[PDB]
Write a protein that binds this DNA or RNA. Structure first.
Ligand SMILES: OC[C@H]1O[C@@](CO)(O[C@H]2O[C@H](CO)[C@@H](O)[C@H](O)[C@H]2O)[C@@H](O)[C@@H]1O
Ligand SMILES: OC[C@H]1O[C@@](CO)(O[C@H]2O[C@H](CO)[C@@H](O)[C@H](O)[C@H]2O)[C@@H](O)[C@@H]1O
Ligand SMILES: OC[C@H]1O[C@@](CO)(O[C@H]2O[C@H](CO)[C@@H](O)[C@H](O)[C@H]2O)[C@@H](O)[C@@H]1O
Ligand SMILES: [Mg+2]
Length: 580
DNA sequence: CATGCGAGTCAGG
DNA sequence: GCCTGACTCGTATGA
């Protein structure tokens, strides 16, 4: 039975009630400077559909949109807020976001539309967006009649679902998480995406020309060493050359053929000169295709900026993700790739890039949650945690710690966070499972509190069915009870890791909110550009650097109070590359 | 030929 | 051992 609503030709007073479910539809996946195809409002007075051209041109409606006292309940308010920003319209008063509410209740559901969220509460009087708009090449906005009914049904669902979702969040003790953390953060992410990051395209293009030159040389050297030309970027073709023509040892095979992963190649390097060249070709090719050409494709030609979209409702741990482009995985580990960062510059003359990052936040969080005396003392002394771990595992003085000892202690620390696994550690340290287990055993002997936490958290995950983070984020782990070793083990590691990675996510999100409040109180022009899991990147007038050096680390270090201090390092410079 | 899928790969924390 | 996203190739359908 069709849903009744008024297809309005003009905005009326009853459409501006102080509480309503609001839909400002942007069908385009990437909502930057995208069109708004329709608007729906459901409130105490009824259900309404408004054409965007009329609604967005009406002073009363626009004023209502920007009035913080007029409360709106929506789904993915960031999408609408950013689309409206590109139109010079401010959206305020969003007191409930169904997407974020759904995400907090169960990030595993992968709720990406109103229909999916509504299905969680047995509400199915709304169609999934894909069914209405189609997908990809066939994606398209339907005729007004169909479009109008769909937006109204989504608004109607939101109107009906707010109460039950809020009630469950409250029983989960996640009400403040939604209202005081995720929703306020959504607005901050909206500002960041809209602001964008300036790219020096001329510099990128120049790097691309040089890369193309080097790739050409390595490419030819590879054909020369192989004795024939082939598609180096084809794991299949490369496999034939390496393991058949050149007879290199097959130490690993994928599900469908020979493995040519870098870790595999690294082992074959001693056998033939072609290997080192393939690795070099892989590095340069990655930079060229993904960080030069890929980046250049998404730079807005008019503003010369990239406007990423932070998916705030995707990861199972509470972390954000970044797309079009992904600005959370710009090269930095290898110098040649790190140079890509010289292309990210301040958006204004005489401004500078400022970057602040937490030092070992995950291990500090673990020290706090596990209450491991040794680990807590280590951070209280602000010791080099890898050297310290090496000292305990190997029972040597600081002077006796060799570079390799520290390298292995570092590997154990990087993994201890992801949940112990002799197999996983063995792979990273290229050792036997028996030996890896011995390392783990030694680690636990030195950090008994951590061992206790690992056992206790797995037990809690089994008892309650989920694990939680410092700010009450949760993750259900049904596989924790599986009678399949591998499946159960994966769930156990998630149980061990989620409270760590997740609480670190909670902390930096809170830091972002606290930071913006401080930046506003101080009337600084500085503003956030990016978040990369444990670091914040801002840009600001050079005249604000000294103030930022004191303000940013403090706000980040004081976001939450743990049993150990939080430490933040910072750097600034003319480009993102220089912010080191 | 057209768009779209998985597989394999590798970039980041 | 955890958490992500983008690009290539080669196959899928489909013209
Ligand atoms: O607006 C971001 C928000 O939308 C979802 C769907 O509800 O993702 C859509 O938009 C992303 C950014 O363009 C795309 O990567 C994704 O493919 C598309 O479905 C949510 O996942 C996200 O929180
Ligand atoms: O010149 C392009 C032509 O070369 C082949 C091999 O003969 O592939 C090479 O060039 C591609 C584009 O630069 C790379 O992806 C590939 O790795 C490299 O070997 C052919 O496949 C292609 O038609
Ligand atoms: O040997 C106990 C030890 O094994 C772990 C896995 O590393 O858990 C196993 O044993 C528990 C019973 O003590 C079960 O609840 C669990 O399902 C099973 O995998 C550790 O958590 C535990 O300390
Ligand atoms: Mg750091």
């Amino acid at each position: 039975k069709k849903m009744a609503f008024t297809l309005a030709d003009r905005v009326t007073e009853e459409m501006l009630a102080d509480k309503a479910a609001l839909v400002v539809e942007v069908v385009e996946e990437n909502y930057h400077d995208a069109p708004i195809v329709g608007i729906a409002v459901v409130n105490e007075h009824g259900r309404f559909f408004l054409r965007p051209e009329t609604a967005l041109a009406d002073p009363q409606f626009v004023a209502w949109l920007g009035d913080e006292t007029k409360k709106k309940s929506m789904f993915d308010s960031k999408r609408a807020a950013v689309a409206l920003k590109w139109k010079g319209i401010e959206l305020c008063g969003v007191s409930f976001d169904l997407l974020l509410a759904a995400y907090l209740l169960d990030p595993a559901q992968g709720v990406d539309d109103v229909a999916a969220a509504a299905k969680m509460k047995q509400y199915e009087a709304v169609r999934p967006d894909e069914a209405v708009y189609g997908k990809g090449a066939k994606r398209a906005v339907p005729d007004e009649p169909v479009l109008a009914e769909h937006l109204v049904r989504k608004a109607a669902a939101i109107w009906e679902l707010e109460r039950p979702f809020l009630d469950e969040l409250r029983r989960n003790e996640q009400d403040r998480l939604l209202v005081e953390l995720e929703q306020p953060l959504s607005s901050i992410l909206a500002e960041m995406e809209f602001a964008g990051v300036k790219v020096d395209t001329k510099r990128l293009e120049q790097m691309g020309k040089e890369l193309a030159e080097q790739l050409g040389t390595v490419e030819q050297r590879i054909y020369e060493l192989a004795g024939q030309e082939f598609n180096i970027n084809s794991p299949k073709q490369l496999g034939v050359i390496l393991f058949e023509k050149l007879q290199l040892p097959v130490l690993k095979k994928t599900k469908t053929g020979y493995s040519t992963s870098a870790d595999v190649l690294e082992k074959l390097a001693p056998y033939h000169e072609i290997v080192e060249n393939i690795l070099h070709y892989r590095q340069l090719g990655k930079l060229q295709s993904t960080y030069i050409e890929g980046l250049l494709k998404v730079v807005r030609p008019d503003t010369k900026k990239v406007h990423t979209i932070f998916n705030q409702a995707l990861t199972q741990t509470g972390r954000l993700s970044s797309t079009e482009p992904n600005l959370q995985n710009i090269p930095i580990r290898l110098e040649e790739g790190r140079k890509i960062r010289q292309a990210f510059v301040p958006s204004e003359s005489d401004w500078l890039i400022f970057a602040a990052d937490y030092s070992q936040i995950e291990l500090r969080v673990l020290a706090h949650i596990a209450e491991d005396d040794n680990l807590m003392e280590a951070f209280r002394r602000d010791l080099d945690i890898h050297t310290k771990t090496a000292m305990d595992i190997f029972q040597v003085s600081e002077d006796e710690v060799t570079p390799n000892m520290r390298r292995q202690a570092k590997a154990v620390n990087f993994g201890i966070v992801y949940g112990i696994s002799d197999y996983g550690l063995a792979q990273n340290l290229n050792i036997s499972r028996k030996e890896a287990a011995e390392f783990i055993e030694r680690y636990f002997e030195s950090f008994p509190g951590v061992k206790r936490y690992m056992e206790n958290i797995v037990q809690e995950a089994k008892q309650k069915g989920y694990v939680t983070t410092l700010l009450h984020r949760r993750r259900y782990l049904p596989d924790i009870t599986s009678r399949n070793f591998n499946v159960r083990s994966f769930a156990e590691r998630m149980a061990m890791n989620t409270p760590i990675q997740g609480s670190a996510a909670d902390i930096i999100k809170k830091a972002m909110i606290d930071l913006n409040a401080r930046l506003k109180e101080e009337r600084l022009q500085a503003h956030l550009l990016l978040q990369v899991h444990d670091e914040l990147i801002l840009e600001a007038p050079k005249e604000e650097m000294e103030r930022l050096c004191r303000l940013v680390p403090e706000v980040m270090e004081q976001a939450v109070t743990l049993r150990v201090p939080l430490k933040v390092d910072y750097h600034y410079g003319s480009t993102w590359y220089d912010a080191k």
